[PDB]
């Protein structure tokens, strides 16, 4: 397998699994396919039963990169079904197989805490999100209903008690803060009521 | 102790540890401090030696939340020194101690791959980043040198070979794509030459 193609199988976006309006999908990524062997075939399995459905390929200098995407059903993922990507290519000893599923274990509700805002010309607004399981989570910010994209979020990290925690921080203009704009950190997780919660912070007297 | 104060100690942002112009800091977060006991005091230790430099506090209904930040030295963090947060409050049996350091293990260079773009009115541009250790990493996007914030990045995940891998997804206007704008996927990691690599993606004939 060394110098040959590598395969990566990605779970669906947490946000996608937790909204009926969107469609969650697993993604099977193949890079470093040899110039001599462009044909790459994908076989998808849900718990064992083969499914459908085309794969997307492009040339990158000496090699090929191929991505295959399969829609999943919200429930199948949340209920813990196992998804398998099988990648076949003429240069491979035996087809490569990858497997992904939602972590099993008792779900635990995240707890969200806005923190003391801190300070030239910009303000840091932060949210702690902790006590959650599994680690699949979506953390976002908004203001006046519209999204705020200038934020960092730490990857979930395991706590002593076996739950996960993270830290999200949003940078805003000092003046938008001083003008009393309401800023919110929204969290989506399977263990929350309505799969959603929100905590707000503003400058108010 | 339940359900008194809980403490969370956070490492410095990867981007801050890897740029000479920024200040990396460890952050000690205390939540659910009882109304009756506002005083929270902080002891900071690097490898076991007390350092100095105040904490911010605020009331949230019936509780207090307190955050204490300590500037660290780039070299100290990368060299694997151990940071200790010790939190003292009158409601605690014994003061609470939290400890953090860079994971030890042989550093491995991330490998960065732009992937085939995919198609309403919007284009998904994607980057695979894999083969890296430790998981401390920063991933961002630019167009014409300016930052693009409308992306999502999976938390680093452990690969069978002991290294980490992730997937980052930027959403762009179809028209900015068609107009030939160069979109760039910037990665920062300790094992990279210059601590930085860029892979770019555009529509070109």
UniProtKB/Swiss-Prot annotation, chains A, B:
Glycosylation site list: 61
Outcome (variant: residue 4 to A): Reduces the affinity for FCGR1A about 40-fold. Abolishes binding to FCGR2A and FCGR3A. Impairs ADCC of virus-infected cells by monocytes. Decreases binding to complement component C1q. Decreases complement-dependent cytotoxicity
Chain intervals for the UniProt region annotation (CH2): 1-104
GO BP of this protein: adaptive immune response; antibacterial humoral response; antibody-dependent cellular cytotoxicity; B cell receptor signaling pathway; complement activation, classical pathway; complement-dependent cytotoxicity
Residue pairs linked by disulfide bridges in the UniProt entry: 28-85, 127-185
Stretch list, region CH3: 105-205
This protein's UniProt keywords: Adaptive immunity, Cell membrane, Chromosomal rearrangement, Disulfide bond, Glycoprotein, Immunity, Immunoglobulin, Immunoglobulin domain, Membrane, Secreted, Transmembrane, Transmembrane helix
Function: Constant region of immunoglobulin heavy chains. Immunoglobulins, also known as antibodies, are membrane-bound or secreted glycoproteins produced by B lymphocytes. In the recognition phase of humoral immunity, the membrane-bound immunoglobulins serve as receptors which, upon binding of a specific antigen, trigger the clonal expansion and differentiation of B lymphocytes into immunoglobulins-secreting plasma cells. Secreted immunoglobulins mediate the effector phase of humoral immunity, which results in the elimination of bound antigens.
Disease: Multiple myeloma: A malignant tumor of plasma cells usually arising in the bone marrow and characterized by diffuse involvement of the skeletal system, hyperglobulinemia, Bence-Jones proteinuria and anemia. Complications of multiple myeloma are bone pain, hypercalcemia, renal failure and spinal cord compression. The aberrant antibodies that are produced lead to impaired humoral immunity and patients have a high prevalence of infection. Amyloidosis may develop in some patients.
Subunit architecture: Immunoglobulins are composed of two identical heavy chains and two identical light chains; disulfide-linked. Interacts with FCGR1A; this interaction mediates IgG effector functions on monocytes. Interacts with FCGR2A and FCGR3A.
Name under which the protein is recorded: Immunoglobulin heavy constant gamma 1
Species for this entry: Homo sapiens (Human)
Lineage: Eukaryota, Metazoa, Chordata, Craniata, Vertebrata
Originating gene: IGHG1
Full-sequence range covered: 117 to 328 of 399
């Amino acid at each position: 397998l060394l110098g040959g193609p590598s395969v990566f199988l990605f779970p669906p976006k947490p946000k996608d699994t937790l909204m009926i309006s969107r469609t969650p999908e697993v993604t099977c990524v193949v890079v470093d396919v040899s110039h001599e062997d462009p044909e790459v075939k994908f076989n998808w399995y849900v718990d064992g039963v083969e499914v459908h459905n085309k794969p997307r390929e492009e040339q990158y200098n000496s090699t090929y990169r191929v991505v295959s995407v399969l829609t999943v059903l919200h429930q199948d993922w949340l209920n813990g079904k196992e998804y398998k990507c099988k990648v076949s290519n003429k240069a491979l000893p035996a087809p490569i197989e990858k497997t992904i599923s939602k972590a099993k274990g008792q779900p635990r509700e995240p707890q969200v805490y806005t923190l003391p805002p801190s300070r030239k010309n910009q303000v840091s607004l932060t949210c702690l999100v902790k006590g959650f399981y599994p680690s699949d989570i979506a953390v976002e910010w908004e203001s006046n209903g519209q999204p705020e994209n200038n934020y960092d979020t730490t990857p979930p990290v395991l706590d002593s008690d076996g739950s996960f925690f993270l830290y999200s921080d949003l940078t805003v203009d000092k003046s938008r803060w001083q003008q009393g704009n309401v800023f919110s950190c929204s969290v989506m997780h399977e263990a929350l009521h309505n799969h959603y919660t929100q905590k707000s912070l503003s400058l108010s007297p």
